[PDB]
Design a protein around this ligand. Structure first.
Ligand SMILES: *[C@@H]1O[C@@H](C)[C@@H](O)[C@@H](O[C@@H]2O[C@H](CO)[C@@H](O)[C@H](O)[C@H]2O)[C@@H]1O
Ligand SMILES: [Cl-]
Ligand SMILES: [Mn+2]
Length: 254
């Protein structure tokens, strides 16, 4: 048989992969005056914690650079994540080519390795001017991510933004105003864009678990008159009953 039980589903767990374009096309003035404050405002709006949002962060240029791993201090504490952005303002100048496909591939690898949290919403935030090393290769991996139920939002940054590509990889429809997946204004709009994707919403649902077949009932405790016997089974789930006791009769007692 099976067991039924109640449960609240809130979708509070989110693995958020922040992929930041650090390539030479971005432009140094833009980096300082626009990208850094974008990162600051965005990350400041994320209530990171062990049990809810966990941040991953990658910087992609000629190489991809994994800045923050899911689960670490910097993944779950907003203040620590902000320090990484500050470290970037002080010590990184954008240069080189644009490994966008490889950055997205790092997310794929998380899923493949089963490093993400299974019950966690998977959310990629791609921050780019939308001029990757290869347009087809980057669209391809993004589409692979979406077919795995990964959500993807795009934030345009840089001195020379290819909106057409950004809208395409975000999945924006033509003739449709205010795409819910792409923003290219300031941090305020990006934050609003990201909000519906990470909103905790609580519903009460019923759940079903297969408890597996019972073992045979034991022989009666007494071989005459009233007694009891029991049947057990492996716990295939936390909510599954594993033991029963019933009253049995083995005829009369002389
Ligand atoms: C199994 O075989 C039965 C035919 C009886 O001989 C049982 O013995 C009886 O057990 C009851 C209750 O357990 C006692 O009150 C009796 O004293 C005893 O004869 C036996 O278990
Ligand atoms: Cl690429
Ligand atoms: Mn570039």
């Amino acid at each position: 048989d099976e067991v039924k039980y109640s449960e609240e589903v809130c979708n509070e767990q989110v693995d958020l992969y922040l992929l930041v374009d650090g390539s030479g096309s971005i432009g140094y003035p833009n980096w300082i005056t626009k990208v850094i404050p974008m990162l600051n405002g965005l990350i400041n709006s994320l209530s990171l914690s062990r049990d809810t949002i966990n941040l991953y962060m990658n910087l992609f240029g000629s190489y991809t650079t994994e800045l923050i791993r899911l689960g670490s201090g910097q993944s779950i504490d907003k203040r620590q994540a902000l320090s990484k952005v500050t470290e970037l303002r002080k010590t990184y100048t954008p240069y080189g080519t644009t490994s966008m496909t490889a950055a997205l591939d790092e997310v794929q690898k998380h899923l493949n390795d089963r490093v993400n949290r299974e019950k966690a919403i998977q959310l990629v935030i791609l921050m780019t001017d939308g001029v990757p090393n290869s347009k087809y290769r980057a669209l391809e991996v993004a589409n692979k991510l979406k077919q795995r139920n990964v959500r993807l939002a795009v934030i345009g940054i840089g001195q020379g933004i290819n909106h057409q590509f950004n809208r395409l990889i975000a999945g924006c429809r033509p003739r449709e105003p205010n795409c819910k997946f792409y923003s290219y204004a300031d941090w305020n709009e990006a934050v609003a864009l990201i909000k519906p994707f990470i909103a905790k919403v609580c519903t009460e649902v019923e759940r079903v678990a297969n408890c597996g077949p019972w073992d045979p009932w034991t022989a009666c405790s007494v071989t005459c008159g009233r007694g009891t016997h029991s049947r057990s089974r492996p716990s295939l789930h936390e909510k599954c009953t594993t033991h029963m006791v019933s009253e049995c009769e083995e005829g009369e007692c002389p």
